[model samples]
Target: DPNSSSMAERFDNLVEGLTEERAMAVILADPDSLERPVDKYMAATRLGASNSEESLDVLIQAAELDPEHLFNRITRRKAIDALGRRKSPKALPSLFKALKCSDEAAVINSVEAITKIDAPLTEADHEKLLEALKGEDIQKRAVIQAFCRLGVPGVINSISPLQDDSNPLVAGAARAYMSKVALQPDGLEVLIPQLVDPIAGRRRSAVIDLGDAGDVTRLEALVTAPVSMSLRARSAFQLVDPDKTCQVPEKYAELITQLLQDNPQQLKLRKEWICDIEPTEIENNLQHRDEARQYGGASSLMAMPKAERMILINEIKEKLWSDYVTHYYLTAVVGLQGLEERSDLIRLALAETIPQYTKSRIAAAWGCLRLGLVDQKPLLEELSVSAFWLPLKWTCQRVLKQLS
Candidate 1:
């Protein structure tokens, strides 16, 4: 038992403390060099993180690497994905080249990336995408999304036949494309029926396709669908979007909390939603809810001066033992702002015997490390592996590294 080994342990150990300079060196190193293998793949991820001309040029070059090795292929695909996020006209040629790659992931990622870049699709690009649609159901879905985003009704004829495709997802995507992009309500007819489908997966897929259909008029259909509350809450969240589309009438503030049940899946969106609510309209949201609002409120309240956040001590105190998201954010505020008096709640979270059924023990882990709770060294090591959420694992890893 003392000498155990697994691929995951080995894999996690790679790319420890990855940085831009290290990534650049690994990416630029010769393939025959004695560099670590996964470094190139990790480098591809960092290479795409920047929008600078040098990063873009390097990322484009990486995407076009036609090496036969498996790792190189993975790196190439990742680089192509990076290009899409850049959305520069400069990355188009590499994405186009990726279209012909035998790797299905590369081809699919390229199509999605092509749509993301600002440049318009050429006739040659259209031919490549059209050919890809005929290859696999998954790629077919990507191409349909590309065409849907383009809003080209003329391609309806090409997409129409897929409505009867063998796989139901492909069929549903085709119908969704035709309905949203081609303005055919008939497509919605097929998708709406799917909401009531017996299989749970099918029901949820329909919920997603309904959103993808992008027809706001179908709001009633999503609201009334007899699906799980999670899907319903999420679909409504995507559709109504109080942050962007409208101010969202007061009736759905509850829905905002419902969307932020404070899991890790969409934490970025949740933070932005909280930040949006905090800046423009701070009072109601902070006092109104527990986690989502108070999470931001605590962070928002704690600017440079202690005077601003000092007043909210009572309000901030209550947030500690609540949701994991709030616990983590509130603890972060405490640690960052010298609230040693408030450190006890974080200790309670660290001492939790529950393996964090709510998974907020990570909040305490952040607190323990940030506040220099060196006694938690062993606890952080245990949690580094046993934690359910992947973020917690890495947090533990970084926290342990920080201690040593």
Candidate 2:
């Protein structure tokens, strides 16, 4: 009984006669008629099918007019997307110019359309892509991923820029792709210290490359002071199974479990260590205490019980403190917020602990800063000009800065 309707008939007409330029004109003229989706579709389809320069004008105007309609936007993007899909010499010039789109999504779509054409990129294509990198919003991370999927030399230039980009997302993607390229020997060495770079993005990129290379040597430093969870997470994920955290080896599993457990003190200490883990330490696992399975520990920690999770943290706490690795202890513990209830104990630890080689007075200053003791400023200032304050002077500057 309800087999047909006027609106349905109009929709079919709009969808079916999409290739007619005059049809597009008819739809565009009656803006009021386009209040309905069927009319909008009709207009968008006709614009897409038309090859006239007017096609650009129609799509741009329709996009502005119906900006809130998702389908309309999709249609507009497709027209823009198709311009790159054609990939003729003339099309390449315009497509290359399209790299300036501020919309991250549009930029991605344009890059995808160009890379998807199954045609090899010429040196000119390389130059244009490189030029796009100079623009502020190219989203190096997305660009690296697109280039990686495309493969080969076009992506080659991306390595150096990505290596240097400050954005974490961009650097992370670049690191992953660079790892793929590193199978060639020389490809990876240049990027090693960058994996552990002070900035998270570059460090992450380096970690991904090391993980893909199965070079645990690169991850050695992360196990100790100044370690980074982002870097650790990346390497641990690659080397271990994501589904089981407990299996992440006692060393990494210990750190990861503490972070997730929300142990307030450990979390702070961990973040502090992220900055402290020097690149020179990556090659030496001399202090490593346990041999863990390469994969599975990370996933296991996520699945562990609360009591057991606390036990994990406690064990790590013992290891760090007993070994006299006091410098970053407070920073690591506070990072786990779930343990805020345990602040009384953390406060006591900060007050009484003495990191090996660091003076007892300097250690007290560190504690005072972590505990938010503003009155301790005089103590910190006095500690700055002491003879025994070899490395402690540098430590005093950093701790005071953190408090500031």
Candidate 3:
């Protein structure tokens, strides 16, 4: 029907040369003026970036727009987030009021907004979160994560029942919180056995929860585990990740290396976690044909003493930087080494536009953040929002947070 063109035409006109004043006026206008509420939704999104008192007040007003309409609900959520970006303690009551909304996205946005405010919660805030935790499975997952960050006390009994939650992801979230946040083995008691679940999805989730817990004991078992290759690789990578303290201990070095050599993807774990490589061997692995050997060699150099690895990196700089994947290891090593001088190389790696090289931007982003190149904030910000990969998005966001 050509009638669809009417909404688009109106939306384009409404947005023509849109400004804060235009956006605010749209929200203040009656909802019935437009059949779809499209302009009002657009208005809320535009006001999200505003810093003025009037914009703030208007957003709060818009957040209460026809609570039952799906179109209105979208506008309402946009306003909720604007309040979060505003980071005003004043928004707490409004954000909390949104907790009662039945939609999962609305409730998720409200809880996330509440956490973003950085205010100390009163007793009421605690009760509201606990009460919401007992509701929607999806809502409970968001609240469970927020509960840990909020550090509400005496919550073990309340959270423990979710160990057997009906949804496996929700159950994993509960176990992860109880084990990682609550420091209780009760969660581990349930999570450990699921590692070998006949359904690969459950097994993979179990491994991830173990990684969240930084469970060092099972890192080796995961190598031989029946899960998919990428998950096995991801599990090993999670433990040894620079952010996690679960670096593979030196005692398991040679054994892990042998297993990793058998699995090139898993080789990244050793490159990430191990630091002691003799100079000559690092040289040999760099020249090896096996992709894992090449990566493990160059990355293992970063794990060694900086005095030695830095010299080794310089020796192989032309070679390592000449390749794609090994070069990624070098950019990541720049962060680990705190090499502010090599930031140009980090910039180049990040600037590459190819899809295969997307994760390469993560290693570069790490170096940029470690070097405190806040000038790269624009690049980091874009990648954080635009990266299609979940881990890449998370990496960029973490780097942006640590930039300042």
Candidate 4:
């Protein structure tokens, strides 16, 4: 035996031969022996027809040896399920430990394994799992699955704690799970109010889930909550999606427009809202539509002589320069109005800032166009190559050409 050649070669031959028994022995003897080739052999074992106690040991050993190796972890988790299906008493602790494993994927796999084990929850186990749902200390996915798999009565115990959870992830998960358990009044009742929960992300996710859950009682609530501005805009946009049911309140149209034109902080989100629904389209449909009214009436404001338009544009542009995007937007409004006749004033405004940055460079370009120092052909061509606002910049260029 001492003089014999290493069984590494023998194990390699056994794995090569595709002999399940010998391969399992080689795996049990040493997981690292076969290097790259052992991986394929292990996969075959887990999926193979013969899943015995010895095979389970081999798989579990592989998991213990290389927990982070993606294939090994996947195969070991499946072997745990196979052992659980066979109701191997030896596997119960491994299943439980895996269910509570620190890694999320490991916990998910372990829970799948536990359900296959089909060991009915005792009164104590039921109480413990339900209590874990409320306790911030325990793992939620495992606890929730235990309660859900245990069915209505078990789920009942999970409801109040989950609704009360400080953790939004846990609370949202409970609401989603309970939404499917119709005829379970307690679950349904708790699921509805979560739609208006304080956090916008939680509230939005809950609203979508509740809508599909067919709980019409909360329909108006989902449509009425004081969502954060971005969420409100997104929820408003969602109304156009055929499968989505939520709608913004009538007051929200005016509120969103004001937010778009007046709220300097969320200018980018406002641009998103503008693109989500056209200003003209919103004006025609929503009773509270007021962007045109709020924006000094777009065409009427444009009707002012180009000189007057330049005066008003300068007034707003001066107030807006602190924010680069607003500065860009105001520059567009002036340029579009063909206010180049008042270039002296525009030049004076550009004089106040150091023109070193791209934003300042853009502002300088717009000011120069207003004075015909640069033409649309060259200015817009260069900006276009840089992927800047070629069209809008070009339009401003044309407006300046005629004014000059």
Number of clashing pairs per prediction, in order: 0, 46, 2, 0
Sort the predicted structures by TM-score, highest score first.
1, 3, 4, 2
Candidate 3 wrong stretches, greater than 4 Å? 1-17, 34-37, 68-70, 189-264, 267-349, 353-358, 363-404
Native-to-model Cα distance after best TM-score fit, residue 241 in candidate 2, in Å: 18
Write down the TM-score for model 3: 0.53
TM-score comparison, 1 vs 3, better candidate = 1
Q: Give the deviation of candidate 1 from the true structure as CA RMSD.
A: 15.2
Query: Top lDDT: which candidate number?
Result: 3
lDDT of 1 by residue, 1-404 (tens): 10121111111234463577777667755666735666777787887887678888888888888667765778788888889888898988888878777888998999888888847777776777787778777788888878876665667789998889877678888877877777776766777777756454566677777766766566566654544334554455455652334234446544433232232223221444244323334433444443334444544555425654554543544533343334445544565554666777567665555442224455566667667888888878887777654445545666687764
State TM-scores per candidate: 0.57, 0.34, 0.53, 0.36
Q: Give one digit per residue, the lDDT tens place, for model 4 in 246-363.
A: 3234444344333222222222222222321233432231122322122223323344466555555555444435433333334434544435664543443333332222333344
lDDT of 2 by residue, 244-299 (tens): 33234545544433322222222212222222122222112213321111011222
Local lDDT at 333 for model 2: 39
Candidate 4's TM-score reads 0.36
Ranking by lDDT: 3, 1, 2, 4
Error of 3 at 104 (Å): 3.4
